Symmetry: D2
Subunit: 119 residues, 4 copies
């Protein structure tokens, strides 16, 4: 399932627990950017997905403040879990930095991450 440790193509680490209620909790350690150590993540997933070979929709957020650094930014990942023996979480993400109003047009980066489950 979703619960476990995952790594993406950048070398970031995603440790997550999926709760019976649809909750995602855990920590994220980013390999790049204005980040060090682990950050809290929270999110949600479809706890009763279709079983017709569709992925399980999910998303989560990290605000890039922990007890060692603050980037004044937040990323959300939106995507789907694809189960089986080579499980993947395939995502697109939005990274919004706090900006002044004049600079809001350049506040948000977009990208895509693929996570592979370890073990």
């Amino acid at each position: 399932g979703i619960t476990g440790t995952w790594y993406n193509q950048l070398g970031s680490t995603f440790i997550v627990t999926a709760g019976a209620d649809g909750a995602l909790t855990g920590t994220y350690e980013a390999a790049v950017g204005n980040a060090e150590s682990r950050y809290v993540l929270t999110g949600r997933y479809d706890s009763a997905p279709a079983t017709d070979g569709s992925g399980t929709a999910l998303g989560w957020t990290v605000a890039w403040k922990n007890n060692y650094r603050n980037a004044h930014s937040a990323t959300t990942w939106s995507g789907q879990y694809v189960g089986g023996a080579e499980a993947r979480i395939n995502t697109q993400w939005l990274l919004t930095s706090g900006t002044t109003e004049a600079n809001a047009w350049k506040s948000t980066l977009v990208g895509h991450d693929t996570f592979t489950k370890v073990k």
Copy 2:
């Protein structure tokens, strides 16, 4: 400032509490889409923003399953809160539906929602 009841340009209702250390917890009621009533949301926000006039970064997720319906999809909103006389949350969002691998290319809608505390 983030804590409260917010409404976007579609008429959706976003009820949220900002916990002191960065949690966002609340409910979302979508006015459009395959949705009815309230859905659980969780997210995070910068609980110590910059003091230079910059907004407060945040994000949250809704999985579109509740006791009424399950759309087999999830939306994340990423944005910033802008305080002031008319506080606003300006976001972009990603709505991913569960799909087959083959159809993953058409799994994700993108858009932008603006929230204020002004009731329609």
Copy 3:
């Protein structure tokens, strides 16, 4: 309807001609960013839209090189034209800067621009 001079919420000026068979050709002058004066744009639009009240899909690209400056970046706008008494072009855009491979993760900004023919 698409042909004309448009302005977005940032004050940028988008001057475009819609050719009969789907071409968009014009210039873009950005009011923000690493840009000055006009830049060439090209794009495409649906030259036979649906007749059910739907907007007209379109998109265009600017590479941010002209005789004045080169930002080593390019923006694409994807959206729809909505005709009517106050015609509008509603878009989302992707601004990709050239980066190293390692830094590609932070290469692309996303946003949304609304255009009308109303001069600021």
Copy 4:
């Protein structure tokens, strides 16, 4: 360089010519979606890129109307060309469908395509 034939992970075909003036022209054949045969594309690229090992920024548009079908939609790809012997064009894209105003919130799909040059 950019001029040539490219294929992406979906099996789509991108035939492009890069002009000295920064123009991109060519045709696109989509392997998926509401599409058949070739469609016109136009775009732009940075004709004087940095040479410090950065990619070359570019973008292009296809409106999904040709003389055999009309999807009432348009895709833009924004990305960068990475030269060398295994040249790539790495993109993110936005596919906007014409909708009614009430349905505009669901008008736009986002994704990512990687193109590999043939030959």
